Design a protein around this ligand. Sequence first.
Ligand SMILES: [Mg+2]
Lengths: 439, 439, 426, 426, 317
Amino acid sequence: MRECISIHVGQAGVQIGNACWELYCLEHGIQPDGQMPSDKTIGGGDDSFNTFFSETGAGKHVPRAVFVDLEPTVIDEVRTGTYRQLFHPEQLITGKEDAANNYARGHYTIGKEIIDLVLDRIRKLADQCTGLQGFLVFHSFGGGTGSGFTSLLMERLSVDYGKKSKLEFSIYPAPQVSTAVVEPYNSILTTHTTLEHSDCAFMVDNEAIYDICRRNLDIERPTYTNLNRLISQIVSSITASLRFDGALNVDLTEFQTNLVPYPRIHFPLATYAPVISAEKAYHEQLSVAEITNACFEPANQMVKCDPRHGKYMACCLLYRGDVVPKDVNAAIATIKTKRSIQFVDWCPTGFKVGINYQPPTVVPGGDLAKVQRAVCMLSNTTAIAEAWARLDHKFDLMYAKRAFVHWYVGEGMEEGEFSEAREDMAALEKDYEEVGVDS
Amino acid sequence: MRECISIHVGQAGVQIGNACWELYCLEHGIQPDGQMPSDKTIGGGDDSFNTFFSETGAGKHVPRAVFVDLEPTVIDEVRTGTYRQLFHPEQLITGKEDAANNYARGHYTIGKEIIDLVLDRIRKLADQCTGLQGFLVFHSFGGGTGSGFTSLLMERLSVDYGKKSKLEFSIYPAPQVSTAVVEPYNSILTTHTTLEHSDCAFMVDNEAIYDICRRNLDIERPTYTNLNRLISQIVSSITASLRFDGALNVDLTEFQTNLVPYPRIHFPLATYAPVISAEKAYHEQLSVAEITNACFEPANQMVKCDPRHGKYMACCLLYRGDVVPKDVNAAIATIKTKRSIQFVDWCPTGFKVGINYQPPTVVPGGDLAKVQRAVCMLSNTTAIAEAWARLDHKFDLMYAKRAFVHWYVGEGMEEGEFSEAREDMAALEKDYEEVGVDS
Amino acid sequence: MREIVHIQAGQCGNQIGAKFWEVISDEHGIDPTGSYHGDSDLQLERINVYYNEAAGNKYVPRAILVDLEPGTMDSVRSGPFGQIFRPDNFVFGQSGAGNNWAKGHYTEGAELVDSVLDVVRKESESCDCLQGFQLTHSLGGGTGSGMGTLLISKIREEYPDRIMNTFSVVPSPKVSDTVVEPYNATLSVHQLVENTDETYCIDNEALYDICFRTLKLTTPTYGDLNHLVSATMSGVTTCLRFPGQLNADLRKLAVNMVPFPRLHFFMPGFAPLTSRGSQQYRALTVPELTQQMFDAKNMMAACDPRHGRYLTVAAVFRGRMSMKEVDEQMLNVQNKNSSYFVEWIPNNVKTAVCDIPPRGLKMSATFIGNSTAIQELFKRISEQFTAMFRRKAFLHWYTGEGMDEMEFTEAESNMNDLVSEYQQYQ
Amino acid sequence: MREIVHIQAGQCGNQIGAKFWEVISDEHGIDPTGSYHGDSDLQLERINVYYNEAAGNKYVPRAILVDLEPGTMDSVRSGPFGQIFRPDNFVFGQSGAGNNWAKGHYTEGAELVDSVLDVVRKESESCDCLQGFQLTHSLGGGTGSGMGTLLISKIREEYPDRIMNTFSVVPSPKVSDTVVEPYNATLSVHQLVENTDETYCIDNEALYDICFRTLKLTTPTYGDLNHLVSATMSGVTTCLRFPGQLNADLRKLAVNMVPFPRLHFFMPGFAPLTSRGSQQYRALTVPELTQQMFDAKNMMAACDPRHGRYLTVAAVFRGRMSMKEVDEQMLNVQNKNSSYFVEWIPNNVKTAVCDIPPRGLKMSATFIGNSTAIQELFKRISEQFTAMFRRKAFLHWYTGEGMDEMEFTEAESNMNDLVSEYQQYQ
Amino acid sequence: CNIKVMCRFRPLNESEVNRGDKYIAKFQGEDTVVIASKPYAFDRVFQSSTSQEQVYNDCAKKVKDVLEGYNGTIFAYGQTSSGKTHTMEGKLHDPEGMGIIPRIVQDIFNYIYSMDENLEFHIKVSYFEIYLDKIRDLLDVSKTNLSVHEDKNRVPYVKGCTERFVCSPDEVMDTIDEGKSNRHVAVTNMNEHSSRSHSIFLINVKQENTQTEQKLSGKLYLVDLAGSEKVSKTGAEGAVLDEAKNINKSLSALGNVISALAEGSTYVPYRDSKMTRILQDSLGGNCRTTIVICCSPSSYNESETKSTLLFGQRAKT
Ligand SMILES: [Mg+2]
């Protein structure tokens, strides 16, 4: 019942968002041209949707977005598509040039000309809200906008505002599939950002989601417009308890002191089920004791690392739909006993259930089934410490011959700002090494 | 599309020219009495022919010639023939006496009375042109006008104008056939001219052209009016790219820095094919890969020396007609492999193609066939160093008894001006000896 | 926005361009007359990357046609799509050039360089924030090489940051057609290397192969070689001009493809390429494209890349793909040839996807390779030079315009170093 | 007279209460709207123990609903029996609480404690001589534990003598639903022990048992767990509100059941409890009640009392009994288990009898036990703490609001002592 | 061996003690410097106490062999107020107060006043800076935008540079000062003026003997580097930024030259950075080069001096 603002950086950002918002405007009845076919407006308190919208006059609803990219080319598809009328045409910022996968070029040299126009449409929005929960910062570790420009937007947003909850959904370099020869510089370079100036960093790779689309959804020729919808329903559920009545609610601050065992160790890796096709539905009567079991298969982790080799340190399970709160207990019961699902000792409690009442919602022409239950684990673990290690063996080579250094030092940075990032993805690794040893 | 002036000296000159111009005025549609049957003269730039003509009034075209001879007897056949109306009756210079195969008599004593009237109709013509390319200086090493008078005209034209391209087509003494007992004095005497004051010197002997008329053209009783037409089409092709659209053009300056490996070594020896009869035509379907092969037979060299005994140092191949520029490449391919066609090493590049679109044109009552392709190699070589050697063994005798010296020293020259010319055709020989040795 | 200007110089440059601007013009629905008859509102959306507005709804391109012989500039004007260049743009001297590099870099061009350097500025300030200069020119003739390189080193002093292209047709021994290539070329390259940030080496031997074997033509007039180099150029910049699902511009490619400052001599290629007697016997989806694309006989640059290793590679696709096709095909052809891709750089293949095809087709891909194989292109040249110069052959026609003898050695050393420093990565 | 006030704090407290005040309200014949439609003049005789008069014959209860998230206070208001709380009574901050005990005892509640401490006084002076504060609240969440304990230690300084209740739902491992229970709980209990005189420990594991096994329900929504803790609460105070043949009030039980100052952690229970498919196969007179009542599977508090000994026990009956039934049943079940009742206290069972049943039934009994078995309830908690704290896990979210590290050790020691001093009597 | 690096930590002023910057160094041996638990390995390093003349006694004595017949060069690197201008220019008029440049020029006049009369030597200077990627002269205000070309033997120089003979110290230093007076714009509103552009100083000594008609030459380069500069902590904008962008792409590219030489690879990237091309001979095999980096141990400059070391840490392995 309270509100949270969203930022999108980079074009993977913007296009994750296109689907995000086509879904939100469907969960609440908000047509493409801003209206919700209305009633006699009798009231005394009426905040059915407010968390992702704002009412203005005569019946129009306007979303709270900050779409930002230096590439001037992706936003235009917005500005003339079927979502023309709806956004507020003074939010979608659009620079002049693009950083071209050069990190140093989104930090200062091509981005010093847009922060002052985007901090402004933040602050004109952080004050049309009565009380503010959090900042959802969608971006993409891959390219260049989403690595420098975000490391600028987040630092500004963390010394001006300072103490808010700043979430972060971010696409990570895969281990094999890639589309940029200079990715392992960007990544190691944005690590100083996703430690000092954020709290939850939900990473999501790509080959993983590709699998999750080929094995389960019976679609073998996917596109980006079918990975983004899954990364969209993770977000319609981590923020599904601010927005509907619940039988056991969990609020975007409860999440963190349930989910973060220390100041730094805060990189959970999400999951979601049921993801079933249109005809592989009726052969399943998928009741709760099943969909809580799909979440721990090391073949639905949206981040390609093996959770078996590791140890969980927390969990969080935001069921939703037609779920009554005993079945969940027998379910967590079954899970608590298994071998090869090794919870660490110092967290014998284990879990944090949370339920809602609204069925997860469908998007026409989509590729998911009208299920009546759902779940999105957000399970901190130690296994993720074996994805970042990969990018290290992709950087301690492309840097031993200073390859591609010139494009970077060319726009201000120095040769040191690389070894800093080295040691600072080395400490993170040492620390998930540590907090997993048993005492 | 730019213009070049022509000089004719000596009577072999004038009669080479008679056919030259009967052909030019046919390539463009210029009737004998100066007119080209015309149109509505709508324009905005119209230079279809200009390179060998100049438009004047009411539709008349006047050529750019300087016909010069001290003999007053050959020009008159012009001045009353069928080419009466057309030339400009103030160009055809005509002196009083003739030099009578006495070189000293065309240099000063009988020629000091015509240079000042011929330099003038040069300069009134070098300034009715917008930009000027070159001077074609037709003459004849044989007689006396064409050896002294030209060595005067060229020196004047080389210190007044100085830096232009000055070409030179010149008939050479044959090794056996001759018609002057005092030829081997003239020749060795004009060598100081065709080194310091010219660039291309296309020599053409006579017995050679006689062969080329008896073996190929099926005419056994030729005349001068059938050697001159072949020496005319060499010139309608070395200047066939200034004058028509081309698929790969070569301009009268490109020629030289393609074709002249040093400052002095610039005596190429031309060639031409197809030369086929009227009935020996249909048994040939002479496509490009054939007519590029006729050019290297040591039996179509228009200068009777053996190219086999020698080494090429450049080439140039100005194809014309219906020739597309791949066939030429397979053709030059075949030629590049053969034994007994020895290109020197230090020019591994080899060739310089060049193509045009206008079929070579026929002259009624002539003796060539309406072919649809043509080619005129201009191949610098080292073999030519074995023609000049001949004239040396025809001068180191007629000078050991000072024979015929009296007619020469009689008109000013001295006994030394002979030994100068000796050493200066000795150095040229030493230098083609040199540039052929492999390093 | 993101505007590109265009410089042509030489008979090549111009006959390439008069076809270029026919493919570009028919992508965006532009008639010859400058008018417009598109059908989809997507064409006219970035029209201002290669065009300018002019009253009454005419569109006129941003050409700067240059050469030293006033015949070419007339041949262009009468062809189809000739009414369109607006006539001030041409700049023609009137004395030819004569396959002598000197006369393009010191004497007969130095007095024409300003009447073009003074149309770039006229055409560099009707644009919001431009991105780069293209420069399409044959590296063999006399205008192209010398005049063009001079033009380029003047452009890189009034604009020391914008990006710089070159589409340079290179000498080849088996279809050579001049006798002083090995002076023209090795003099041009000592100055392309210091003053551009990308150079697509087309060359005519290979471009002939690609029309004998693959496209199976009886007779390749030049009109069907230029019509392939045109499509590579149209490709390398298709994200600036259409909406895409992973956008890449000249800056993208020029940062992902150049692994050091100097090694920027790419080789292009295009696929599909079907003799349209053979077309019904092959239906291409993505993998057919990506397998033709890496063939030894679709490198428009004459060399066999198997004797070398791709340092980096780019692939700019056009059409509706399904992006895992792209990603997994690239991983496939990266793991099948583990010995042809250099090790100490992982994930060598940069990709991109546009969304409108070239009209008439449904899928197309423009490969841009950067291989160490070019070790051989500049190598044979050096032979055909280190013999000729070793006897000062043909030399005088150069000393006559001002150059020194020393300058040749400078070029030579500076194109032997380069080969040395592809050779380390072999 | 003998009036009781009522404090709810947390999502629990409120959803318990909205059912509480439905059982209470239908005992006394109260409609939702505050009006009255009883039938027997006995109902409206002590109506003023849980109610207040308001003009026009409306009756409005004495609730103080409290929580830090403004959703609950709306859910209450729309339910059945919601029109009834008079609206000034709610007190809601607007920033949630976040399962962090700190934010309920120092920061985000310390600025809401007064707008409730200033409605207790408004609701503590419309009464002649009141008797105590109830406080129904879940010991696991963030409002309940910290905010509620703060409220309680403020109430026990402006009223150092009146009696103090608490109905605290306790953590259980087999149905745990948060990750920082073992901080919430052990911090709450270090302050319930010093500042209340009776505490009924309900807990959710056992309350689920009692609806799987005994009441034989397919599906226990929360609406049928709260509907049992409501009946225990309605019981423990039924003599204040009806005529009886041996009356017992909160003071009675709180003097007969607490054998030292600290040991006041009772466990409740209720009987009959019949799956009303099974109801016609059992007719209960007194002995059936008193045998179900002492079953290991009707201790709403999760522990097996057989591993412990009842120190003292109370039984508040309702219905028309024949009192020797009561007395001799109690002597019976005191001599059958001579090893489960502590020796050095004789006649352990306090009894009482009301006279009106809960409507629809004819006989009912509310057991209140005080066993040393609770030795285990606080014991397992300590494990789930002495591992977590031993690695400062989850600790920062507490230091961030003011608490010290030391304060945790204080709590720990002070909930290990307690177990030691039930353990002597074992 | 081939290459040698030198670090020198100046002592502390009164502004630091007023602000009370802590002392942050730690040493050990004569090789290891350590700041904040990170080890830096070097060759030769100097405390707050070591005196000026041992600096050059261990740094530039083996200049002797420039005059005796081979090539040489010395870089100097330094952020603001880190002793650069104190360890090179130095107290000009104390025998025990001068810096490094005069500690060279004096050895050269000594060698020329103490050698036999059968031998004759020539002393030559040149002074040019690099700025925004154009090689500017200093001794000639208007000769700007030079280029570079080689000879037949593949050793480069600058085509047009003003060269003035030199025979006396005053001549040397007079040139030095007149050149200094015309580096491009340098000083700010605060005190971050740290030589916005590089500078190069060539000292040519040629020798010839008449006993044996043997003629030798030695080129001696003095390089004054500019200061690396980040683009957050500074906050620059507009024109000054174009300076930043450039300085770096030199130094970082320079890095590679100093790497593969010391490493030992097959071929070395000399072309990509106009300065390394001017030196190309003076760094390589059978040539002696040494870097002279200057670093402050105070705290208000902390995140600076870290970098001031990593650069040098390159030139070792
Ligand atoms: Mg040309």
